[PDB]
Design a protein around this ligand. Structure first.
Ligand code: 3RJ
Length: 276
């Protein structure tokens, strides 16, 4: 029963109060990723499970099981041996536009599936995207995701109560936060599409469109700065196509009423009719 049913192999990743192992279900050849964490993370794990447990999609990490032992919580999910998108970007320094398009089609498929269900990812970022290998990107961390309109602090507090402080724990990365959210609005489908624009920009250029180590500077850049066009760190490499620049200009509109819609996003020339 429970974790008795799994072989644990090497550690493949770590986080705060967290270790991820490669594992295998005993009596099978089914390999899994097993996240082992402190019980204080029950709100984050419960949220991840409740949002994804019934999702079966190629571009979203599959849920299998979660279990509790005397001193740990355990989450058993799909194994992705290709690492994070953050590592891919750091290695190549910059990705060719054809690769960005291929990866982008994966990101679109997964995000479209979530938004259809009313699920906001809220912290779209390279470290929360895993690769199957060679490609096949998957959204892979739902601690901070939520259903549209939900108060996630309230949800975290309710989980913690059964067993204001939560306003901090629900904070993801500020780098990809849409301007309207910086200004106090709640996350939305449109703010996720902004973050997608930041991610596509970073995949091609190797760096996010708006970045500062300082928080106050980053806030001002998101609200004032115009980032186009993305230029690879390797200045000798090909420049962005006019279709790709046009796509980013639509996604990185600061005014969400002017931002590219899903319907226009899927029809955009950059995808070369991938969604026709
Ligand atoms: C090389 C190759 C693979 C990985 C890897 N693979 C995974 C991870 C998972 C699930 C465990 C919950 C997602 N499925 N596949 N993960 C990691 N690092 C990591 C570390 C703390 C994490 N907390 C959520 N996700 C995390 C991810 N590094 C890797 C480095």
């Amino acid at each position: 029963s429970g974790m008795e049913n799994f072989i644990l192999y090497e550690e493949i990743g770590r986080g705060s109060k967290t270790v991820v192992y490669k594992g295998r279900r005993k009596g099978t050849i089914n390999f899994v990723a097993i996240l082992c964490t402190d019980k204080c993370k029950r709100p984050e794990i419960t949220n991840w499970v409740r949002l994804t447990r019934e999702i079966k999609h190629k571009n979203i990490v599959t849920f299998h099981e979660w279990y509790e032992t005397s001193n740990h919580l355990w989450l058993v999910v799909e194994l992705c041996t290709g690492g994070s998108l953050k590592t891919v970007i750091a290695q190549d320094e910059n990705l060719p536009e054809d690769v960005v398009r291929e990866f982008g089609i994966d990101l679109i498929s997964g995000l479209h599936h979530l938004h259809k269900l009313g699920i906001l990812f809220c912290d779209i970022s390279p470290r929360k995207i895993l690769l199957e290998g060679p490609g096949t990107l998957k959204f892979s961390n739902f601690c901070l995701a939520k259903v549209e309109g939900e108060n996630l602090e309230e949800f975290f507090a309710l989980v913690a109560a059964e067993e204001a402080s939560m306003k901090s724990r629900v904070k993801g990365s500020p780098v990809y936060t849409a301007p309207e959210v910086v200004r106090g609005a709640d996350f939305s489908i449109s703010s996720d599409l902004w973050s997608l624009g930041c991610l596509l920009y970073e995949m091609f250029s190797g760096k996010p469109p708006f970045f500062s180590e300082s928080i106050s500077e980053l806030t001002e850049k998101i609200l004032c700065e115009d980032p186009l066009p993305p230029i690879p760190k390797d200045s000798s490499r090909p420049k962005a196509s006019s279709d790709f620049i046009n796509l980013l200009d639509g996604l990185l509109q600061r005014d969400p009423q002017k931002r590219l819609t899903w319907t226009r996003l899927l029809q955009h020339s950059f995808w070369k009719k991938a969604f026709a």
